């Protein structure tokens, strides 16, 4: 079994299509950890609306059918379609569309359109992830951008940049949107994820999302890097026991500065009490040691 | 040495952060053939302004000057940094800051900002990567927005979307821009690719970014997907010969389709004549079979 040698800064955030800023680690008391990108069992199962490019996370791809007069200015209707292009369909055992996001938010990025005469246009939008009419899983969508240059039947492509926050509009990255729309409740999710050890808490990828409006730090966590989910994918290994000592080494000593517990389900857990950075040298990488139980008692961070 | 098993729909594009469209073929007569970004050596050995953050390639990260009230309305000064936060070093044997894009264009995407109290904006932006001051490799690039609503000296990142086209603005993906600026010649480049045998041709991996304005197929051609670039980088294999032998496999029938040859350099070619896409089947992938000599005669298509 082995893991991805790439550095911190050479990885890419799971949940959203930036680079990994910091290792970082938390209780998340009264909350459920359950997201849906960037989920996959070490036996290379991708799981929730994970999907293997990066580039495709929180994007997605339709078909603009109306603007919406009577929504604010400026509101349109997409019909989704999945990321290869092929009719979203509500029976396949997923969440959402592989790529939809799975956080409550104004996510803000750009709407692309292209014609069959290469005729092209974009614009800034921004997508309601908390709104009742978000139902991805059946394919419907809307955004609000400010401009009316959007041609109506013509293909779209939504770009993610970031996320606006507001009073109206919060942020949570950890309360999933209601894939289904309006009442309907979530089916087929990758589970939820805790640590199962005294002492242990889980150890998170944190970037900071850009923003397009109000205070925000834009943090998003997740539980492995997307290479490492490519990895896992590619490898099809078999997963010895539930629990892979996994030890944190700078190169520029060889040493081992600490080390976690690589479980099956595709996320990690230290031995450490607190919410805050876990700071270590640029160059360090996770590398696999041994296969071990629910019970190896890990050396403190 | 290994070659990753994804297929192509699960590949990145690694001169533009979308997914792999199609394999390509062309002759590319009068052109010096030199991409800057996707270049890696099969020992591992980036090149040009090779990013290993996928989702980063033609992004960049830099300060905000100022807005230049004598230029187009809103046209700002940026400072350029590095993508991992580092300042721009010159004198680093670069042609220019990892990501930087490679070809002439208005690159078209989003400039973001977070100012000290965490408050944030964001905006479409433009780049012109043909403009005399597009100085990237000295850390000066300028982009327009039609947003008055940046503020000076705090941070900003570009989150490139895709290209816009008009008469004064062509897009030209094979040549690459002046990165020092003015009439600055290039240099530490990533050497130009071509075929260097009878009717062989380079495979291209080919993507169709999004446009954001006039007529633009957006067609983007890159040597090596990025999982590879990622890959050889990781793997730092030893390159026994100057040419790895791969076989294009087809898993449903267990068969091989047809042979390339994986060049040193990082680049493939084939024994195929003219420009048009290489269609095969979807669950097809390329596989390392030998290490051959540069004069290894490959098999038509």
């Not at 509500?90 to 569309?97: G, H, L, S």
């Amino acid at each position: 079994f082995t893991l991805p040698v790439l550095k911190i800064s050479e990885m890419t955030n799971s949940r959203f299509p930036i680079p990994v800023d910091q290792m970082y680690t938390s209780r998340n008391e009264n909350i459920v950890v359950q997201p849906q990108n960037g989920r996959v069992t070490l036996d290379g199962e991708l799981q929730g609306t994970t999907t293997l490019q990066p580039v495709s996370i929180c994007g997605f791809r339709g078909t603009l059918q109306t603007r919406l007069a009577d929504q604010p200015n400026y509101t349109y209707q997409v019909h989704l379609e999945n990321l290869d292009g092929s009719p979203v369909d509500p029976t396949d055992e997923v969440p959402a569309p592989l790529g939809t996001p799975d956080f409550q938010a104004q996510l803000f990025g750009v709407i692309s359109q292209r014609s069959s005469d290469n005729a092209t246009r974009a614009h800034e939008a921004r997508v309601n992830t908390n709104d009742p009419t978000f139902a991805p899983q059946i394919a419907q969508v809307r955004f609000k951008s400010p401009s009316t240059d959007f041609s109506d039947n013509e293909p779209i492509k939504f770009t993610p940049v970031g996320i606006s926050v507001d009073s109206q509009n919060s942020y949570n990255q950890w309360l999933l949107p209601r894939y289904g729309g309006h009442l309907t409740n979530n089916t087929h999710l990758a589970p939820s994820v805790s640590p199962m050890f005294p002492g242990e808490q889980i150890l998170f990828f944190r970037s900071f999302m850009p923003g397009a409006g109000g205070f925000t730090d834009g943090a998003i966590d997740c539980l492995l890097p997307q290479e490492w989910v490519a990895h896992f994918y590619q490898e099809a290994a078999t997963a010895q026991t539930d629990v892979a000592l996994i030890r944190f080494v700078n190169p520029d000593t060889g040493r081992v500065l600490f080390e976690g517990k690589l479980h099956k389900q595709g996320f990690i857990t230290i031995s450490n009490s607190g919410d805050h950075p876990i700071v270590m040298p640029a160059n360090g990488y996770f590398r696999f040691e041994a296969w071990v139980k629910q019970f190896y008692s890990l050396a403190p961070v």
